[PDB]
Design a binder for this molecule. Structure first.
Ligand code: HEM
Length: 374
């Protein structure tokens, strides 16, 4: 749906992201485009600290604000984490923190790099006349040489793009229920499951483009936040904007709207409960663009697909409904192998609670498989 900033082609991802800010913002852009060099040489913090404060007034459209959020988000992670080996900063200087906080308040996102910045808005086609394939795409920003950010961001992006093909069927589903069109609804469900199965294959590409040590020991350090982090146990001081430090979670992949989109579509009850899984999942919506926050809530408000399928004593409908449910399980099962490869093992070889992170993921999967109708 157009009202919810959902693209037919790229889904939750931002269509054709802007690459240039107005010349007014060059001092930001130059720092962001040169993070690998500036961090390596140990100059990044000096360059940030001698920035003047630039007003956000000259950002004139949504895409401009998205790019500015990406630029400032990347500079922030780099400033806080520096070279990525424990020498941190607890005060984001006034001349970044104030405009970053104002912009974030206008976009209804927290002042930290999130998935919608470093993945959904961080990309370009190399040649626009060619399709959305890895070898024709690129990211706009990276942190360090050899951080594998192009691989992680683009493959996450390509999964979002694959899911878009299922997302665009969702309106067909609800109207089918409202028009009592049994065959249309069944075809629609099968199509969604098929597209979700194609999204699972896209996920396999991460092995070709992301290397585990680089991810765990470099990229993951720059995507880390300051909520419950002993390195910044009190959060980050956004100097000149809030007096006391604030805590925000790191820009994980867990901020995608794709799994939750189909959770609520299928009536899978992840957000219900007091447990640590519901709270974490519901907390992650805070980090999704407000338009996508609204989309998930609208879906939660429409009549239940699950109640519809169970009401009709239709084996065809249940089997198609289940095909969607299983594809969602398969995604989470595969995603679990990915976390094992890219976090658990590299951590075990010395450096992510380990077991408490896995049970969370296993819980969400288990909750998902329990929803099968059989
Ligand atoms: C190297 C690849 C990846 C790693 C290491 C990774 C890591 C993680 C981690 C650690 C969590 C637990 C919560 C947290 O981050 O604190 C998580 C959950 C999650 N991840 Fe990823 N992720 C990766 C790729 C992806 C991709 C590509 C997607 C989506 C396209 C994704 C979607 C999710 C979702 C939705 C959750 C929340 C749990 C759920 O909905 O079932 N992840 N991931």
């Amino acid at each position: 749906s157009a009202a919810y900033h959902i693209d037919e082609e790229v889904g939750f991802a931002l269509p054709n992201p802007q690459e240039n800010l107005p010349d007014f913002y060059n001092d930001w852009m130059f720092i962001a485009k040169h993070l690998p060099d500036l961090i390596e040489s140990g100059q990044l913090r000096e360059r940030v600290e001698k920035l003047n404060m630039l007003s956000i007034d000259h950002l004139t459209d949504h895409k401009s604000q998205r790019l500015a959020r990406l630029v400032l988000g990347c500079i922030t992670m780099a400033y806080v984490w520096g070279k990525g080996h424990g020498d941190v900063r607890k005060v984001l200087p006034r001349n970044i923190a104030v405009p970053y906080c104002q912009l974030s308040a206008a976009l209804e996102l927290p002042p930290i790099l999130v998935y919608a910045d470093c993945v959904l808005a961080n990309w370009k086609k190399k040649d626009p006349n060619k399709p959305l394939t890895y070898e024709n795409m690129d990211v706009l920003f990276s942190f360090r040489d050899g951080d594998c950010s192009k691989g992680f961001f683009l493959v996450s992006l390509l999964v979002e793009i694959a899911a878009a093909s299922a997302i665009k069927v969702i309106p067909t589903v609800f109207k089918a229920m409202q028009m009592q069109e049994r065959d249309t609804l069944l075809k629609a469900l099968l199509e969604i499951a098929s597209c979700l199965e194609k999204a699972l294959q896209v996920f396999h590409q991460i092995h070709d483009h992301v290397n585990p040590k680089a991810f765990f020991s470099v990229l993951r350090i720059y995507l880390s936040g300051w909520k419950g982090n002993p390195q910044l146990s009190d959060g980050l001081v956004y100097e000149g904007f809030w007096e006391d430090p604030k805590e925000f979670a790191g820009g994980s992949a867990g901020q995608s709207s794709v799994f939750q989109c189909f959770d609520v579509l299928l009536g899978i009850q992840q957000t219900a409960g007091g447990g640590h899984a519901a709270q974490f999942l519901q907390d992650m919506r805070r980090y999704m663009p407000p338009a996508h926050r609204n989309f998930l809530c609208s879906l939660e408000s429409n009549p239940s697909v699950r109640e519809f399928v169970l009401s009709k004593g239709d084996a065809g409908l249940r089997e198609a409904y289940d095909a969607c449910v299983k594809a969602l399980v398969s995604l989470r099962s595969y995603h679990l192998q990915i976390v094992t490869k890219y976090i658990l093992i590299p951590a075990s070889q010395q450096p992510t609670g380990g077991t408490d992170l896995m049970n969370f993921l296993k819980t969400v999967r288990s909750t998902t498989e329990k929803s099968l109708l059989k």
